[PDB]
Amino acid sequence: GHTPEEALALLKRGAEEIVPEEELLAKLKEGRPLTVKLGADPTRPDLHLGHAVVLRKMRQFQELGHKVVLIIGDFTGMIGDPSGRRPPLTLEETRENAKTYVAQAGKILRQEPHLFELRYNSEWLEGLTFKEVVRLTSLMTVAQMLEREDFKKRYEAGIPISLHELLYPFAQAYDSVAIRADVEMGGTDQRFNLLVGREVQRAYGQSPQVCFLMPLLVGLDGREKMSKSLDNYIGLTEPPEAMFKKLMRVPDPLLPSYFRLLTDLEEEEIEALLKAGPVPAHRVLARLLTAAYALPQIPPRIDRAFYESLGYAWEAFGRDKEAGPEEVRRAEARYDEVAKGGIPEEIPEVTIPASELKEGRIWVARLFTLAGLTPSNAEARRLIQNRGLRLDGEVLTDPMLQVDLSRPRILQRGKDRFVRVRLSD
Amino acid sequence: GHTPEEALALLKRGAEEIVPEEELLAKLKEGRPLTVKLGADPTRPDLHLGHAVVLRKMRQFQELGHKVVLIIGDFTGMIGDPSGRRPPLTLEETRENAKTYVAQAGKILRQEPHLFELRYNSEWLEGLTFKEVVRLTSLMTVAQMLEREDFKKRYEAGIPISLHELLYPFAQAYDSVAIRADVEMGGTDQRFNLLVGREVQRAYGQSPQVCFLMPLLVGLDGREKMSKSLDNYIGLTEPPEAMFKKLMRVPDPLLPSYFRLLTDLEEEEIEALLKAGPVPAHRVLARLLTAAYALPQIPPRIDRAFYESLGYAWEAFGRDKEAGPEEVRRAEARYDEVAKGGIPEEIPEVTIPASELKEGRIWVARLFTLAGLTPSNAEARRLIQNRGLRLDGEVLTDPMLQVDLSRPRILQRGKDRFVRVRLSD
RNA sequence: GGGCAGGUGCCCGAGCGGCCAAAGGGGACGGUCUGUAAAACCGUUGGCGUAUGCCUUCGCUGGUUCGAAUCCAGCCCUGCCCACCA
RNA sequence: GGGCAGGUGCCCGAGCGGCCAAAGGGGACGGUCUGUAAAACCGUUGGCGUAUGCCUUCGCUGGUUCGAAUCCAGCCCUGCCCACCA
Ligand SMILES: [Mg+2]
Ligand SMILES: [Mg+2]
Ligand SMILES: [Mg+2]
Ligand SMILES: [Mg+2]
Numbered sequence A, B: 001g002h003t004p005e006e007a008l009a010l011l012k013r014g015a016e017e018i019v020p021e022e023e024l025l026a027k028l029k030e031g032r033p034l035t036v037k038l039g040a041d042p043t044r045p046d047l048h049l050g051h052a053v054v055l056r057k058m059r060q061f062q063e064l065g066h067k068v069v070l071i072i073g074d075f076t077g078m079i080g081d082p083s084g085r086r087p088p089l090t091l092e093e094t095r096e097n098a099k100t101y102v103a104q105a106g107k108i109l110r111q112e113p114h115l116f117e118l119r120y121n122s123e124w125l126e127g128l129t130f131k132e133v134v135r136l137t138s139l140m141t142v143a144q145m146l147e148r149e150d151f152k153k154r155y156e157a158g159i160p161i162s163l164h165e166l167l168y169p170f171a172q173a174y175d176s177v178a179i180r181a182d183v184e185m186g187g188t189d190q191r192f193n194l195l196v197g198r199e200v201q202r203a204y205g206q207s208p209q210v211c212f213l214m215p216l217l218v219g220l221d222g223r224e225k226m227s228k229s230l231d232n233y234i235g236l237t238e239p240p241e242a243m244f245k246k247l248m249r250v251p252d253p254l255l256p257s258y259f260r261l262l263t264d265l266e267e268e269e270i271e272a273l274l275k276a277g278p279v280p281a282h283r284v285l286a287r288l289l290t291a292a293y294a295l296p297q298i299p300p301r302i303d304r305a306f307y308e309s310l311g312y313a314w315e316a317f318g319r320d321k322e323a324g325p326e327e328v329r330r331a332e333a334r335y336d337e338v339a340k341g342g343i344p345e346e347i348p349e350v351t352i353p354a355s356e357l358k359e360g361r362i363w364v365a366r367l368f369t370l371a372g373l374t375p376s377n378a379e380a381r382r383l384i385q386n387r388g389l390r391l392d393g394e395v396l397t398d399p400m401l402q403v404d405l406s407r408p409r410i411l412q413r414g415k416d417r418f419v420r421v422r423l424s425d
Numbered sequence C, D: 001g002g003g004c005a006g007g008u009g010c011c012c013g014a015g016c017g018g019c020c021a022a023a024g025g026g027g028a029c030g031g032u033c034u035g036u037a038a039a040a041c042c043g044u045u046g047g048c049g050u051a052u053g054c055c056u057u058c059g060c061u062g063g064u065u066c067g068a069a070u071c072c073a074g075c076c077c078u079g080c081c082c083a084c085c086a
Helices: A004-012 A021-029 A049-063 A074-079 A091-105 A130-137 A149-157 A168-179 A188-203 A240-248 A252-262 A267-276 A278-294 A304-309 A326-339 A364-370 A377-385 B004-012 B021-029 B049-063 B074-079 B091-105 B130-137 B149-157 B168-179 B188-203 B240-248 B252-262 B267-276 B278-294 B304-309 B326-339 B364-370 B377-385
Strands: A017-019 A035-040 A067-072 A116-120 A183-187 A210-214 A349-353 A389-391 A409-413 A417-424 B017-019 B035-040 B067-072 B116-120 B183-187 B210-214 B349-353 B389-391 B409-413 B417-424
Touching: A004 A021, A004 A049, A017 A021, A021 A210, A035 A049, A035 A168, A049 A067, A049 A183, A049 A210, A049 A252, A067 A091, A067 A168, A074 A091, A074 A168, A074 B130, A130 A168, A130 B074, A130 B130, A168 A188, A183 A188, A188 A210, A240 A278, A240 A326, A252 A267, A252 A278, A267 A278, A278 A304, A278 A326, A349 A364, A364 A377, A364 A389, A364 A409, A377 A389, B004 B021, B004 B049, B017 B021, B021 B210, B035 B049, B035 B168, B049 B067, B049 B183, B049 B210, B049 B252, B067 B091, B067 B168, B074 B091, B074 B168, B130 B168, B168 B188, B183 B188, B188 B210, B240 B278, B240 B326, B252 B267, B252 B278, B267 B278, B278 B304, B278 B326, B349 B364, B364 B377, B364 B389, B364 B409, B377 B389
Parallel strands: A035 A067, A035 A183, A067 A116, A183 A210, A349 A417, B035 B067, B035 B183, B067 B116, B183 B210, B349 B417
Antiparallel strands: A017 A210, A389 A409, A409 A417, B017 B210, B389 B409, B409 B417
16 A cells, blocks of 8 residues: 555665665565565564664564564684683574573564564575685775774774674675565664675675664663663563653653654654653653563554554544553552552562571561562661662661561662561461 | 614604604604595696605605695686686586696606595585584684684775685695595695694594695795796796706706705705816706606605716716706706807797788797797797897897898897798798 | 775886976886996886888877867766765 | 793783782673662672681792892793794
């Protein structure tokens, strides 16, 4: 139901760069399903909303009739860094992690075969001969390859670059040859390797792939890209209660990009939400995405129609807190209840064996560590000095307190981490 | 008949560097035939006295009971430079060139199997998998590999380095792993790649090879290394007449190195020859080597005993021109006859068809080109202006001369190139 | 994927419309003197049988011009510089 | 194959025998004020149930010393610099 020009315009929204854009228009006019490549690193199988930026653009390709080929990078996943300057995965860890990745990616991507194929690049890379590897690497010079920013910066700074790292752009580029990619997806940070793909496809007599680059989502800290290692992320499989709370804590300046990169709202609708204020805009964002990722798969369009289909009223601009799917309504209620200093209805339970007692009690610092709220008794003590711990809703001021557990106690660390502890022989 | 220490001392003579030298002593004390590697590039199968420096050291290893493994580099010979920034050999040109190389190398190397094996590195390189190649290249960093002088100089100068060129040191190093090399031979200009061999052998759990580096022989120009492309070389298969003349024209300052790198004369004997004067020293050098390379194989020791076995007297210091093998005596006589302005007894004949005539004659410039002495009539004319051409022993002063060929004529270009021309329908 | 600059004779490299088979350095080649060496000095370093000429010639293919190695356009390869940078 | 220098806390990085769980910048974490936001301000940023203490702590393994993150030795990895350069 879209002309090629309409399809290009839909696809352009949110993108940092489509290159060459005119080539994508030509491919869209061929009236055939385009092969849309995404390489996935099996060593990092847990997806977050940052990964969803590219994956939802791929879903849009699929809704337009194009075919995702998801390439698990098990070849390099099983080699890793053989020098040491992440460890290598076993064949079992590789299929396990691939399974996790595909399961989470399927919360976004269509899975019908005509729209989706899973491949493992070991299928074709394991057999690539030395001679073919030499001829592949001859396609670029040393100076050309050192232009990539992490090579240039490390080299000029005296930080080691393993020479095998110069082979990996060619493996990724060969993956494009192996599947005859029409488009390769990536974040902006993959631009160089995607361009190498074009060069390698030309050398193999193929049409060079369009490189389709999405911006990187910034994390909850407000400065750095969302990433697992920076602990600033929102995972696609986090419980609705936690996803909703994290989305309410997205720094205000990031709201436009979250709406543009994670929903399909029109720019006029986004502006209308921001005019209602930052907290209203947050509630709408959190409801949309918490709902979408609570489903087994996000809808084809996370848009105003989807919002109203959940039971919310657009013209209420966040005030209609009692509507929505039960999972979302409850999550939002918990957020507000915790905000005004209340204790939520359901909190995690940790049963503590009687063997942990000492003179019939448990030192409060060690109790928090046993409950999993603190990593050490020393840290529990420091948090008490900083008024960061509560017991039964009272701020702890005595770091020597010995806690009576003859009835369950409610422990709290910071703003919203609660554990109810009770004794059990 | 040599202790390990005696063997090391023999081997050290002429060498620029044995590294680690103490490791070679340890290997010699094992009392077993050591595997002595030489890689040979099949694209350059014609050998000259420069190649003889390394090859004669290998012969000395063989005379001490050690085993040469001669590795034809047909893998890289058949790939070449796939970018273009020498062309690739066909499988037929590769075996043909290998045949030429081995034939000439056998003028120096023993050929018994226990002392000599021929291998082609395609035997093991063609099958090296991509995974193994990645792990090989991980053994060095970019900065380490760019230390090699031609990489550092080209990179700093903005001269292209094809990235596949960074793979070739690993292929050469893997060849050492494949044959379990104890020693790898090379000129000083191969020091870096030989050291990479050590590093790769260690990674494969092998004893790292001793790197055995010979200096490079300087050519007849007196400055540059002897090499085919600089036209300053003496080929191992040149006719005795020409080898003898070229050896008489070795610049005086190179005499010590030619004696050290190409003969086994003692330093005392070499000094005694130089004391007799440069021309006497030249005659002895030219007789020794012309004789040695006129044989189907050089003797185990090109030394004073070998000299006297040819019929010459050491104490004559070159004056005994009438002695020696017929081939040498005749070559030396030709040299002296040409020197004093005579025409040699036997000169090449070129028969010229009558169709080349013009008004019953041939313009002298075109005659020299037809005889193969000049590459163009223009050059023949320039040489006449420079008094570089003779006809029947007279210096040509008329560049318009039309030559009568009703009897054979003797043409001369420069000092010692002669062609007798005669007509033939 | 974007920009700029470069590719010239045996090599490096200059060339800013004619003075260009082309500066300068190097190399090689011929000769003198000899030792078939070096040095020093002089010469040579696209081709063509009638020359006041013809052919070809500066990465490739075209173009403006009486005339292009030079200026213009498209292309090839390279270098630097962008892009990428969390 | 040879030389020198480097590797420190969440990160960068200082440390020149004790003043070192360790400068400075950054990050993160707790709290106030709130909007479970930012800002600003104050605090925190090896472990240990009795603490004036104990354990562990600056690439690895040892050593000098009352005492080593610091000095010494051997080793690992890296960077620069050699070697290689025709
Ligand atoms: Mg570019
Ligand atoms: Mg470009
Ligand atoms: Mg080194
Ligand atoms: Mg070293």
